[PDB]
Amino acid sequence: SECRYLFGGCKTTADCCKHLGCRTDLYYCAWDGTF
Secondary structure, X not given: OOOOOXXXXXXXXXXXXXXXXXXXXXXXXXXXXXX
């Protein structure tokens, strides 16, 4: 994996991988894969 695991303290979607979804309000990689 080349992305930060759940609660990786991200800032933007680019910070995480497709599998994850960096939230703008939570600011963390959300492991889901489907949005």
